[PDB]
């Protein structure tokens, strides 16, 4: 196994996957690394199994159909994995914890949103459709763009949104377009 967390790239108290060489901090894995379970298989491994069980699941999909899917166990897992892929980028730090807004010439968003809030909402099974999760995720970046206006810090929201969107298209096998 690797000697650093796959998500935050630091050493520490690491749980090792039994079916691949990745390792994780307890609360860096999503869901949090399960108490017992020997062998244990990471989310990466669980996602790859879904694909292997149903090879046709990789054929292209329309975004509108994916959003309307109910949050059954496989879709729950795919959203957890997508959330984890965003935490994998170090720029996710800016979006992880609860924000506050006090900048001359700007007003805070009407509905603040942040990664740890989405993480708790997934854990608490608060989303009934993929659309709920995706809407909260895109709201994080949209709030940031609107609040920061012409400050160059706006770019951090474009960057992390791009990570989200690329992973969304990969995980949910969105039909490729120009």
> Which residues are at the interface with Zn ion (CB under 5 A)?
5, 7-8, 17, 20, 25, 28, 42, 44-45, 54
Q: Select from 166, 172, 163 the least CA-distant residue to 79.
A: 172
Of the pair 42, 82, the CB lying nearest Zn ion is at: 42
- CA distances (Å), 175 to each of 3, 78, 159, 178, in order? 36, 17, 22, 10
CB of 53 vs Zn ion, minimal distance in Å: 6
Of the pair 28, 86, the CB lying nearest Zn ion is at: 28
Number of H helices, E strands in the chain: 7, 2
Q: Is the peptide bond before 60 cis (omega within 30 degrees of 0)?
A: no
For residues 34 and 38, give the distance between their C-alpha atoms in angstroms, rounded to a whole number.
Answer: 10
Of the pair 5, 84, the CB lying nearest Zn ion is at: 5
CB of 60 vs Zn ion, minimal distance in Å: 16
CB of 71 vs Zn ion, minimal distance in Å: 20
CB of 109 vs Zn ion, minimal distance in Å: 29
Of the pair 7, 140, the CB lying nearest Zn ion is at: 7
């Amino acid at each position: 196994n690797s000697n650093i967390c796959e998500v935050c790239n630091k050493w520490g108290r690491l749980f090792c996957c039994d079916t691949c060489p990745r390792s994780f901090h307890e609360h860096c894995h999503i869901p949090s690394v399960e108490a017992n379970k020997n062998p244990w298989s990471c989310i990466f491994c669980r996602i790859k199994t879904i694909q292997e069980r149903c090879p046709e699941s990789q054929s292209g999909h329309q975004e509108s159909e994916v959003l309307m899917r109910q949050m059954l166990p496989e879709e729950q897992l795919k959203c957890e994995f997508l959330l984890l892929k965003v935490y994998c980028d170090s720029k996710s730090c800016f979006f992880a914890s609860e924000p506050y807004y006090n900048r001359e010439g700007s007003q805070g968003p009407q509905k603040p949103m942040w990664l740890n809030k989405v993480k708790t909402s997934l854990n608490e099974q608060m989303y009934t459709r993929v659309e709920g999760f995706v809407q909260d995720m895109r709201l994080i970046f949209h709030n940031h763009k609107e609040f920061y206006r012409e400050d160059k810090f706006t770019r951090l929201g474009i960057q992390v949104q791009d990570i989200f969107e690329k992973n969304f298209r990969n995980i949910f096998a969105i039909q490729e377009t120009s």
